[model samples]
Target: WTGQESLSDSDPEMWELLQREKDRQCRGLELIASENFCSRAALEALGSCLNNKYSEGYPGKRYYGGAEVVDEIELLCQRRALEAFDLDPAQWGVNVQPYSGSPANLAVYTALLQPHDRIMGLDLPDGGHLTHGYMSDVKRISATSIFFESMPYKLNPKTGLIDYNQLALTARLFRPRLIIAGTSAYARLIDYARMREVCDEVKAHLLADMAHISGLVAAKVIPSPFKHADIVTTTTHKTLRGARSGLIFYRKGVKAVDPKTGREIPYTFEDRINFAVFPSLQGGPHNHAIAAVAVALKQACTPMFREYSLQVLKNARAMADALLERGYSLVSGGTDNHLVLVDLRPKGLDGARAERVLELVSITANKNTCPGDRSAITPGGLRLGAPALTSRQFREDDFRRVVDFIDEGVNIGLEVKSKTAKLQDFKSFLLKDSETSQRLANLRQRVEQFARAFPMPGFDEH
Candidate 1:
């Protein structure tokens, strides 16, 4: 058997494909909620030789030799994370080691809960993530993971706003050991204070996963969950405009009792998080990522970041409004954060179809489940965001143009699917249409030109 083709010494075709992909990214609109274009510095670090090193411990205490530089990087990253979240390093510790958000959440679960301990998280279809116990495999590991049951919590279904009443009732009933406030697909501002009150009533630990909204929170475009939740977890990239990594934090002083002996444990916020990340779950930390994360955090703290953050929200709102005006049903009627979820069921379309149609036009997004959606996971709804596009320097006017493209795609797709009444045939026809192909190619060119206007901080030279 032959080994796979290589980009360096062999495989010109594959290399060209890789270049095309890069070029496509440079020229295309990125609307995926979980994705972002890293800065040149971040990309350089991520693609560097640091991946070969193994420093299996915290800064100043690595298990490997020749770790002095790595240790300094890790320490700096931790410090920046603490400052970014307004956390006291002395009181609240940060574990910048978790590979990504899912592992970070898993580490939190391992450190905080025992098997069978009751916990509450948002439902996946209602904007919750897999690490929040929505996935069957993950839920199976817990004793009993109670997803907060509610109706129209994300929006009015008729009007988009936070559903405080349903949330209150769910908290009263489940009374879980932990209550999490966050979402993956739902697009609206969450009332963290109300959630804190409910968690207080049950004496439950409130954990806020601000993975999707960390940039907004850091930018102060949305409320920060720091004061309300006992612990908060976030990925550094999305809106913070940094590397792909996770950050875990705890408030100043929160106590946890050992379930076995009922012994009161005095935990300074940082100790619990550090222990959970190091000995409890992860081993080695990614030092280069830490270096990149530090740079990103510092950038996020700048005045320019504030402008970028506000613009992200503005772009999102404008895009959502444009979609709504085109007769698309948006979850919560729009968004208060960086993302928007469009329900295609009303139009007799599915999310998968929407994703495919958009991709055909050089627009990238993900298939997602709407609030209370009954469609299958693969074909439910489309999830889009403004963060990446904003990072690419797209503004309100550009967003409106993007929305128009989406509207055109959706309308044509709906018409074809309705008439053909066959998904496969409709998809084929949609992809083959000369008009659609030409529009997509044109859109791709425009996106490339736009992306070039706002060069990514690092990769422009290459």
Candidate 2:
């Protein structure tokens, strides 16, 4: 019985599927805002023997035996995580244990609040994440909403920006136990100082979920939430460009002095957050992902990563300008980070149709809800980002070309909509119509030709 065999030799079917997936990635452009291409070194660590370890606890504290090497790996990961953002270890501590983005947020909430406690976050339709407590007029939409009482703040419909004045008023009245300052699709920088003031007024904890823009934060290209947040959580993927994992940072020392009580306000999140991640929610941390996260953090500290992060911003701006030139309306008018939210209502289209048409032409993106939307299923916005192709070294000009491709693809979707009256009819026409089918085929060919020039990271078999 041979214990070792190559993937192709042992599992031919899975191997063939893996190759096909690689081929698809190589042929298409990934524009989903919450995605990025991790480096080969990071990928290698994720595919390493570190996965064989069963380290159930934090560094130097284990539930299983034989954790000596795994302990070192965890410690290094935590150190690198702190170093990546130039955080002071005395004032901050990190947990590289939570499984992924949403779970990391869940861990943070669970650590700080009891069941049915009040929490406030940006509204889901206005760019907040599901884990930030999603609910509808009909029922709760996520576990965060199921366990906690949540009141969502929203963006101004006319400007498509967070109505902070309303948020402050709501916080003062709602008096939430915790308030989250972050977003999943909003393009502008959050007013963290204002959030801090609001939290202070309401006496609520501030949790910043920087899952979408941690890399930019680390690069110092964007304003950081670390200065004001009591607790910060991020996925190691997305903008971090690492394996799919998570990190939680909680303030560890003196924060400030109470103005009225004449008492020092000490940070109390580290132990609670760490305990919640391990004993409360998860066990047997993914050591492979932790190691990969360490590799990514090390890379994030380099000058090259800073440049990449800046380029991602520049690329987004170029794409936004090109889209605006073609008469597409962007949420908040443009971008300050790596993503842009295009409101598709003006183009006589919905996000689902735009996403499908782009996918048909080998350009990948996602449907998103706009500020005034009521339906998540058929939202009116398409979310695009520069992280993935920027990792492939795409520049501003290339991003403008990407905009051109998307404009053409959306135009195709409009043409299909003009002819068809129903969703099923639209799909059939896109598939069966000779003229439109040929147009899509030609566009796909052009996209593949352009994409081939930019290789997928970690998938270069050569």
Candidate 3:
């Protein structure tokens, strides 16, 4: 076998290129709704030695020979996660396994429903996830997956809130086995109680995928679905600001039965869930992710986490207001949570164009479909959020500047190409100019300074 190249004697050009990418990430603003920059502590745990081990089951009954420490870490993670969300350890259980949100969701489907069972979820183009029937693969797994018409439940062409009457009507017609209440791009607080009521009416299982707003829920900044949904699935890295992994939680006392036969099932909820996750689908758990998630869960339980959660919403509202004032159109008028969906069609631009324009100026976001978007998925609208930037300690004032930069960039396009060109020039100049480098460094430094003042519990120093 060939020997590895030595970094000390490696090509300077290649190393410089890699360094530039890292610097770009450090300097740019990331506005992706489903993304966040983790704490140094979380990063360390993810890169730890735990990755070398393999534990095939839950904490107490791992199949590995040397799983004592592994079991302790998994147990601690489960306990902390349960406590963070105000769940009882005895009744509610944590998997801390499923590698990511999609797998976790699939595990739930496998455990709870059978082949050809009727599943109802949000429409894809309207703001739902692929796991909820946007993909052919997911469709193949389920017998019948139906998209509940969002237009009826969504505001009337003139009004703005959910039309509960329409939702109830659809529930009666579809009579789905599972009703999923979650979104990938929709920007408003979901009425979990109403969704739960619908499930009760249809005798369906209510699953809330709060992957997008777990942080807000944990901090009590937004309403929690724990009391409404039979099961809750979330990714630890979004507004939660934890490690890159998925989490599954079961609310206490919820039972399931065959949707078609209407017969009561005798299996315990926890046992059915565990069997589905392990033997049915996934093989081993990622212990490193568990350790990091545990730390994040502990951090979420503090008063400071609540403050951060509130600030995230404050920043979102500020950004939404700024966008609207500049003649940009927003879905649902504005946001009630940590994100805003901007309709680019009004400005004669498509979501794809807007995304490209923002990237040039070192700002990042994604294209999304609006309530009545006629354009294709790639050309419809832009989805913006304050989670990552807020995690970096940006306030409303900063959001104002960010909004101005985005609006100007999107409007001018390559005509004011100088705007983006100048930023590129500035980035290049900073590489050689110490003074300019120091100034550029201050942005993240200031962010870090503010972040430190609002220290999250259980976060270790970098």
Candidate 4:
């Protein structure tokens, strides 16, 4: 009874690949904004026997026979999620489903808007997430053009901040059915109150996509959109550090006066959103994933989690200061949250190259589009963040070292890019050069040792 079965004997191929991935993670720094490592409790829940259940409906109303236990798991998750964010179930109804953040947004639209209805979202290339209604032929903005009309708003050209005056003007002119508020790479706070005001003027639904800073909101360090938004959606990972899934929070109806009739158009989207999630958008919700979310929400309520959220901000600020002191140009001149957007044009570096080159030293960051004058394929900007490392008990001093690692990585890549001129050919040349190769090899050793110093919480598996 005490013995555990080995996956290596059952599936050698998958086990080998997992080992390689484990090595990569144990060695590299993960700075991707939407990525995170979950606690072992959450991991266990995600891999539990709950995965065998196929409950197709919500609590107490499932089509399957053995939904009694699944119902308790889901209801517990919903209650913990409400308490973690200090939300009232009387006002806010939580849906811990929809798979991930993008579909959650789609479900919201499916619940509220018809085909061809106008929608307003932050511009895709201007730091907004893709699901926020990007209308490009090449990008996947939830098939935005086919499903609904989309209008995009942008950041200030000079300040890199959201131009609320312009946003309000756009909302008035476009007269959209739904207005989305949140961002992917913008290094500033979103003013939900102002966005609600604009949506109110047009009788539009307001959705706050707090996928990035949900942990901060849970910790009460940042403002919540519940007071202003008709619906709110966020990924369970990111700052939440849960399973990779999505949750939606909403109130039945917001108080709004109809512009034409001058009567209050009380809003209600709860039942519609649920119908959209189950019968409309998806089939069976992932019970294991939902149980894992329950584990994460309980963790988020602890005092240590609040300290972790505060440390995340402090680490980001310290990294921003260190980068800026070295003359690195941060978008909007600095950051107010867990991530920093670095425009690499000043150093004549392209994002695609830095993203590739930095990996040699076991550092990881994502290439992203800068505001204007960006090649859609490979922009001249990189987004670095402190959340994943912060989760491993990293502090301001740790991020200071990470910034130095990145700065050195870029310089090494510039020499290679200056010589090769072939973007895809650098990997070979990098390994061939004695000086460059040796530097990275030595740096990887130090990085591996550095990462080992901070053990991941509750993660004991190989």
The numbered model that scores best in TM-score is 2
Candidate 4, residues 66-141, lDDT tens digits: the string is: 8889999999999999999998776788999879988899898888999889988888768887788887756544
Query: What does each candidate score in C-alpha RMSD?
Result: 4.9, 1.8, 6.9, 2.9
Better by TM-score, candidate 4 or 2:
2
Each prediction's Cα lDDT score? 0.75, 0.92, 0.75, 0.86
* Count of backbone clashes, every candidate in sequence: 6, 0, 1, 2
> Which residue window of length 10 is worst by lDDT in model 2?
453-462
Model 2 earns a TM-score of 0.97
lDDT of 2 by residue, 1-462 (tens): 595898888989899898888888788888999988888899899999998989897777788999999899899999999999999999999999888998899999899999999999999989999999999999899999999999999898888889999999888899899999999999999999999999999999999999999999999999999999999999989999999998999999887899999998987888889899989999789999999999999999999999999999999999999999999999999999999999999878999889999999999999999988989888999999999999988999999999889988999999999999887898889999999999999999999999988867885651
Task: For candidate 3, report its TM-score.
Answer: 0.81
Clashing pairs in 3: 116-143
What is the per-residue lDDT of model 1 for residues 171-244, given as tens digits with 9 covering 90 to 100?
67766778778887778777888888888887888889999999888777688888788888889878777888
For each candidate, give its TM-score against the true structure.
Answer: 0.87, 0.97, 0.81, 0.94
Ranking by lDDT: 2, 4, 1, 3
- Give the TM-score comparing model 4 with the true structure, all chains together: 0.94
- Model 2 spans > 4 angstroms off: 256-265
Q: Model 4 Cα displacement at 77 (Å)?
A: 1.0
Clashing pairs for predicted structure model 1, backbone only: 27-448, 40-458, 93-270, 116-143, 127-184, 156-159
Model 1, which residues run further than 4 Å from truth? 1-14, 135-162, 253-269, 432-457
